[PDB]
Amino acid sequence: GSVVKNVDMTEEMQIDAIDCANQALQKYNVEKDIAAHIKKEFDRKYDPTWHCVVGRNFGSYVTHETKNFIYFYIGQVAILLFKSG
Amino acid sequence: SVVKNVDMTEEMQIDAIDCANQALQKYNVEKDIAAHIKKEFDRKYDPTWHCVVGRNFGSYVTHETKNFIYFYIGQVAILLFKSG
What we know:
Chain B: Keywords: Cytoplasm, Cytoskeleton, Dynein, Microtubule, Motor protein. Two copies of one chain form a homodimer. A four-stranded antiparallel β-sheet of chain A has the order 1-4-5-2. Chain A is globular, with a radius of gyration of 12 Å. In chain A, helix 1 (11-27) packs antiparallel against helix 2 (31-46). The first copy, chain A, has a single domain (1-85), classed as Protein Inhibitor Of Neuronal Nitric Oxide Synthase. Chain A has 85 residues and is α+β, with helices and mostly antiparallel strands. Chain A contains two helices and five strands. Chains A and B meet through strand 1, strand 3, strand 4 and strand 5 of A and strand 1, strand 3, strand 4 and strand 5 of B.
């Protein structure tokens, strides 16, 4: 339960981020694909544009001002999910 | 592997990495490591910064972040951000 989140990431959205991350980790093996599934699901449910990186071997990203985000873990795997640009 | 805001340019990123390396060199406990990075960024780049190191930290709800960097020192995650 170690989480950093924005005030606009309320319980329902946080529960959905955890559920989506669990669904992505259940379905896919490659961390880039896991991240992409979470990003796609949040664009669809909570409107674009979301970005997501999973684990610690991801492509670097320069973001414009984030307006909402959540940083959390599924076991040892970090998930950063944020809305920007 | 870094995610950062456009305002975290190379000099500030270099300082975040150096600060994190200095904190990990000096302190054993991840809460203290994070607090050292936060204190140094408040002093050098003005408050209010917040920092969490590793994956066993106290949760935090932040108001709109205006600058941040997410990066790793080996297997250890560092999230450093300015808000509230």
